[PDB]
Amino acid sequence: KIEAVIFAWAGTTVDYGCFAPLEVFMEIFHKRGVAITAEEARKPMGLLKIDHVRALTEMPRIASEWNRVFRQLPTEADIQEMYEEFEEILFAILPRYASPINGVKEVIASLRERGIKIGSTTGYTREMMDIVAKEAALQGYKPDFLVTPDDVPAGRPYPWMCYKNAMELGVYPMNHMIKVGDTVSDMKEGRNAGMWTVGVILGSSELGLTEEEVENMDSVELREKIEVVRNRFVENGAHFTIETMQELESVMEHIEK
Amino acid sequence: KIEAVIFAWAGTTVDYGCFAPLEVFMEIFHKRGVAITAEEARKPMGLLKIDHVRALTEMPRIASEWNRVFRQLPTEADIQEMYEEFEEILFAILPRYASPINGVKEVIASLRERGIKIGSTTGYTREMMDIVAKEAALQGYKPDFLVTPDDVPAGRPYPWMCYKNAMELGVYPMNHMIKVGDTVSDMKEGRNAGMWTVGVILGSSELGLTEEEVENMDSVELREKIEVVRNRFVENGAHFTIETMQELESVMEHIEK
Ligand SMILES: [Mg+2]
Ligand SMILES: [Mg+2]
């Protein structure tokens, strides 16, 4: 019996394609000569934003530039400074990226009718979530609980946020819970948490596509991109992979049998 | 691979036979004119002390008698009142019951040599543990971390405290941890938390015998009560049972395969 589902936020319940952080991540590196790609900017998506900045400076290709430019590799000063700007730019647009993804609300309402708790973990800080959650609620979305990396010792890939969700929801064991995410870090989080782990494809950070891009992309080109994402989720621990949240119910039924 | 081991306190690491509260639970019920057996007083051993008193007033036999004497079932005021008496008495003699069991420290140090994290959960309140922890640490025992029901939403059999241990000890998944306990509620905590659950017999609250009673007893009767406890632990989820802590190491190595 699955008693609770723990949802990721960006790329899973709100912000289709997880675009809020994408342009900001590139902006803070561009202003210094390092032109990171969208694909690199998306690789560590899901972890705490500051950890994400660090992960980017860690990547060989990104560290390669920086060193050759500033004549030295990134230091804790360079990370903290860019993250600082990340926040200033992020906070101004953040209210715009809290729109519940297309069919998530109906799935949430469906899970509640059945008495399934609605938990959630995040890559955003608490300060960011006061904005995201308030704005999302205005738009019709508010989970039963919400834990940010600020509430536990560390964010993803660690299962700490998931454990806190369980405590406050009163659900045990962990296998009585499903974790639904859209990034590679969400999958590692679910598995490290010992919970049934699901990956959403459309609207995910891993696809990196906007709604319009999905609706207008060549059908074959899309599927090709969908399988790449599905395979990525699988290689990274996903027990299940769903194209949209509309299949969540099916995964739940499968698990219970 | 087992990365950490969580131990119960009274009856597992310290206070052989778990006698510290036994006569207290008995004293507070006898005062009200409702006598309770040692077996009854021990059945819910492990739960947060206050929860333990509520569990006693919950037991059909005890509830029946109270209804006979007072013409009503125990009130929250009664439980609250009894618990106030439980503390006043328990505190005065707590220090005397916080001494490590014969050969536990040996296994403990042997585990630390193998790079193993040592966590702990309890039924004693934080305030209560301050006394036990300080005194226990004076006699050679001090785990890497300790959690009480005051730290989480509820104590045993809930797995909350264990998750806290997991968070703070940076270990995951839960099955990379072993829960070592001596009560039924300890077995339930381990299983509820998704970890390797092991019950210790000699010195457990489930045995209820002191060291002298164990040695001064016939080898037929001892191997009779040990089998009762062993069967109790197992029927309650224990994966493995050990007569003494010196068998833990083997259980681990067994699990590694
Ligand atoms: Mg996510
Ligand atoms: Mg115990």
Query: Do residues A131 and A137 touch, judged by C-beta distance below 8 A?
Result: no
- Produce one character per residue of A102-111: b if its CB has 16 or more CB atoms within 10 Å, e if not: eebbebbeeb
Judge whether A166 is closer than 8 Å to chain B, CB to CB: yes
Determine the Cα–Cα distance for residues A8 and B90; give it in Å rounded to an integer.
Answer: 46
Query: Do residues A185 and A205 touch, judged by C-beta distance below 8 A?
Result: no
- Non-local CB neighbours of A68 within 8 Å, separated by 6+ positions: none
- Count Cβ atoms below 10 Å from residue A99 Cβ, excluding itself: 17
What residues in A contact B166, CB-CB < 8 Å? 159-160, 163
Residue of B156, B163, B164 to mutate, testing the A interface (most A Cβ within 10 Å of its Cβ): B163
Minimal Cβ distance to B167: which of A152, A170, A172: A152
Alpha helices in B115-242 (DSSP H): 126-138, 160-169, 184-192, 211-215, 219-235
Minimal Cβ distance to B160: which of A167, A174, A194: A167
Query: Residue A165 corresponds to which amino acid?
Result: N
Question: Residue ranges of the domains in chain A?
Answer: 1-19+98-256, 20-97
Instruction: Tell me whether residues B163 and A166 touch, CB distance under 8 A.
Output: yes
Instruction: Tell me whether residues A167 and B174 touch, CB distance under 8 A.
Output: no
Instruction: Tell me whether residues B175 and A194 touch, CB distance under 8 A.
Output: yes
Q: Which of A138, A133, A111, A112 is nearest to A122 (CA)?
A: A133
- Non-local CB neighbours of A93 within 8 Å, separated by 6+ positions: A20, A24
Judge whether A124 is closer than 8 Å to chain B, CB to CB: no
Residue of A117, A150, A163 to mutate, testing the B interface (most B Cβ within 10 Å of its Cβ): A163
Cβ-based contacts under 8 A for chains A and B = 47
- Non-local CB neighbours of B216 within 8 Å, separated by 6+ positions: none
The CA angle A139-A189-A197, to the nearest 5 degrees, is: 80
Determine the Cα–Cα distance for residues B132 and B146; give it in Å rounded to an integer.
Answer: 11
- Non-local CB neighbours of A28 within 8 Å, separated by 6+ positions: A53, A82, A83, A85, A86, A89
- Non-local CB neighbours of A174 within 8 Å, separated by 6+ positions: A159, A162, A163, A166, A193, A194, A195, B174, B194
φ, ψ of residue B120 to 5 degrees: the values are -150, 145
Query: Residue B190 corresponds to which amino acid?
Result: G
Instruction: Tell me whether residues A159 and B168 touch, CB distance under 8 A.
Output: no
Cα atoms in the 13 Å half-sphere on the side-chain side of A115: 4
- Non-local CB neighbours of B65 within 8 Å, separated by 6+ positions: B34, B35
CATH number of A1-19+98-256: 3.40.50.1000
Query: Residue A60 corresponds to which amino acid?
Result: P
* CATH fit for domain A20-97, picks 3.40.190.10, 1.10.150.240, 3.30.380.10, 3.30.200.20: 1.10.150.240
Q: Which of B28, B26, B20, B77 is nearest to B46 (CA)?
A: B20
Query: Do residues B41 and B183 touch, judged by C-beta distance below 8 A?
Result: no
Residue B242 CA: distances (Å) to CA of A1, A237, B197, B199, B248: 32, 35, 11, 6, 7
Judge whether A145 is closer than 8 Å to chain B, CB to CB: no
**Listed resolution, Å:** 2.3
Query: Do residues A139 and A99 touch, judged by C-beta distance below 8 A?
Result: yes
Burial category of B35 from C-beta neighbours within 10 Å (exposed 0-12, middle 13-18, buried 19 and up)? exposed
Determine the Cα–Cα distance for residues A72 and A66; give it in Å rounded to an integer.
Answer: 7
Which chain B residue shows the shortest CA-CA distance from A159? B172
Bridge partners of B241, per DSSP, are: B199
What residues in A contact B194, CB-CB < 8 Å? 173-175, 194
Determine the Cα–Cα distance for residues A120 and A208; give it in Å rounded to an integer.
Answer: 21
What residues in B contact A4, CB-CB < 8 Å? none
Query: Do residues B41 and B26 touch, judged by C-beta distance below 8 A?
Result: yes
Q: Judged by CB atoms within 8 Å, which residues 177-196 of B form the interface with A?
A: 191-194
Q: Which of B163, B202, B165 is nearest to B182 (CA)?
A: B202
Tokens of A97: 């990226």
User: How many angstroms separate the first and last alpha carbons of chain A?
Assistant: 9
- Non-local CB neighbours of A62 within 8 Å, separated by 6+ positions: A29, A34, A36, A40, A56
Alpha helices in chain A (DSSP H): 20-30, 38-42, 49-58, 60-70, 76-93, 104-113, 126-138, 160-169, 184-192, 211-216, 219-235, 248-255
Query: Do residues B205 and B181 touch, judged by C-beta distance below 8 A?
Result: no
Query: Do residues A118 and A4 touch, judged by C-beta distance below 8 A?
Result: yes
Classify residue A253 as left (phi > 0), alpha (psi -120 to 50) or beta.
alpha
Segment (H or E) for B7? strand B4-7
Determine the Cα–Cα distance for residues A24 and A20; give it in Å rounded to an integer.
Answer: 7
> Look-up: residue for tokens 């992309």?
A217
* Ligand found nearest the CA of A190: 1
Query: Do residues B241 and B234 touch, judged by C-beta distance below 8 A?
Result: yes
Residue A34 CA: distances (Å) to CA of A48, A50, A70, A76, B3: 22, 18, 10, 17, 41
Q: Which of A20, A41, A42 is nearest to A206 (CA)?
A: A42
Query: Do residues B169 and B145 touch, judged by C-beta distance below 8 A?
Result: yes
Q: Which of A91, A22, A94, A30 is nearest to A66 (CA)?
A: A30
CA–centroid distance, A166 to ligand 1, in Å, is 18
Query: Residue A146 corresponds to which amino acid?
Result: L
- Non-local CB neighbours of A38 within 8 Å, separated by 6+ positions: A22, A26, A208
- Count Cβ atoms below 10 Å from residue A51 Cβ, excluding itself: 20
What residues in A contact B159, CB-CB < 8 Å? 166, 172-173
Residue of B6, B145, B167 to mutate, testing the A interface (most A Cβ within 10 Å of its Cβ): B167
Q: Which residue pairs from B234-238 have beta carbons closer than 8 angstroms and sit at least 24 positions apart in sequence?
A: B234/B199, B236/B184, B236/B187, B236/B188, B236/B191, B237/B187, B237/B188, B237/B190, B237/B191, B237/B197, B238/B187, B238/B190, B238/B197, B238/B198, B238/B199
Determine the Cα–Cα distance for residues A190 and A217; give it in Å rounded to an integer.
Answer: 31
Query: Do residues A123 and A48 touch, judged by C-beta distance below 8 A?
Result: yes
Chain A: give the shortest CA distance to residue B195, in Å.
10
Determine the Cα–Cα distance for residues A36 and B135; give it in Å rounded to an integer.
Answer: 57
Taking the C-alpha atoms of A130, A136, A140 and A143 in order, what is their torsion angle to the nearest 10 degrees?
-60
- Non-local CB neighbours of A187 within 8 Å, separated by 6+ positions: A181, A197, A199, A233, A236, A237, A238
